[PDB]
Amino acid sequence: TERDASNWSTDKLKTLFLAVQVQNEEGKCEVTEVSKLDGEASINNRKGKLIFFYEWSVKLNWTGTSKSGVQYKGHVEIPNLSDENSVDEVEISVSLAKDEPDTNLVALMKEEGVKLLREAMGIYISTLKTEFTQGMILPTMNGESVDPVGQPALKTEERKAKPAPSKTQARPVGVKIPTCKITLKETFLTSPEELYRVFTTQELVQAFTHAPATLEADRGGKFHMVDGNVSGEFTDLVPEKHIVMKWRFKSWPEGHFATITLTFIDKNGETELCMEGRGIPAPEEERTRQGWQRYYFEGIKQTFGYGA
């Protein structure tokens, strides 16, 4: 528990206030009488924890003479402004020269009068905490240091092998997951041969996917797109004629793909892609269809400009 040493506050702040200095008659300043910061304040710390929270106001008065030969005694008072923030930015009330032709005189006070108070804030912060606690700290360190060693770490072995599909054996996959059909028929402002590449050319995929993808145009080729959120394999790749591929979202169950089949048709100017998606999870059905054209047709149509 720390106490707000107000004794030193008024002591210096009051003096600093009753110590207002004057420059030239053009912009001179003199203190006639200063009250003291009247309010309640409290701070908490213990050698490494300085937090300031208070609410008080100060009231004083000064005099400013002008070469014109006019003297005026203004009043200054700052409400419950909190010094927790930039103390110098504290809002201070001023009422000098404004009533007399001096005016400009106060302008200097604004950069010299209230300024003097700025210094009052310096000791306020420092003196108030530069007694109860000390800001003197020393380096810290451990006599001995230790680094990671034996910890629940995972370890696996790797090997080289190149297995290929065999007619004699088969490895079917799938889970008792809901499913539906996503047949889409869209016309492309491009030739079937052109669109074919888009579905069988990575660069082109990475183009309309506006994301990183990986594509292998081969029977069993692996295609991964949309930041790899989309993955599958090519079950068939008829040159610009037809493509059968497995499809899924990275959010789909492991070993769960939708049977997708794309067909290419020359419409003498454009192409009619006949899609036939099956196995698409019912819960993901709305997603699949929506995430299709948008990233597929509607995507290509925009990226490549094959739309109508």
Swiss-Prot record:
One Pfam short name: AHSA1
Tissue-wise expression: Expressed in numerous tissues, including brain, heart, skeletal muscle and kidney and, at lower levels, liver and placenta.
UniProt record, GO biological process: maintenance of unfolded protein; positive regulation of ATP-dependent activity; protein folding
Post-translational modification, as annotated: Phosphorylation at Tyr-196 enhances binding to chaperone HSP90AA1.
Induction, per UniProt: By heat shock and treatment with the HSP90 inhibitor 17-demethoxygeldanamycin (17AAG).
Source taxon at top rank: Eukaryota
Keyword Endoplasmic reticulum appears in the UniProt entry: yes
Residues bearing PTM Phosphotyrosine: Y196
Cross-linked sites for Glycyl lysine isopeptide (Lys-Gly) (interchain with G-Cter in SUMO1): K155
Alphabetized InterPro entries for the sequence: Aha1, AHSA1-like_N, ASHA1/2-like_C, START-like_dom_sf
Alphabetical list of CDD domains matching this protein: SRPBCC_Aha1 (cd08892)
Role noted for this protein: Acts as a co-chaperone of HSP90AA1. Activates the ATPase activity of HSP90AA1 leading to increase in its chaperone activity. Competes with the inhibitory co-chaperone FNIP1 for binding to HSP90AA1, thereby providing a reciprocal regulatory mechanism for chaperoning of client proteins. Competes with the inhibitory co-chaperone TSC1 for binding to HSP90AA1, thereby providing a reciprocal regulatory mechanism for chaperoning of client proteins.
Family membership: Belongs to the AHA1 family.
Oligomeric form and interacting partners: Interacts with HSPCA/HSP90. Interacts (phosphorylated on Tyr-196) with HSP90AA1; the interaction activates HSP90AA1 ATPase activity. Interacts with HSP90AB1. Interacts with GCH1. Interacts with SRPK1. Interacts with FLCN. (Microbial infection) Interacts with vesicular stomatitis virus glycoprotein (VSV G) (via cytoplasmic tail).
Name this polypeptide is given: Activator of 90 kDa heat shock protein ATPase homolog 1
Source species: Homo sapiens (Human)
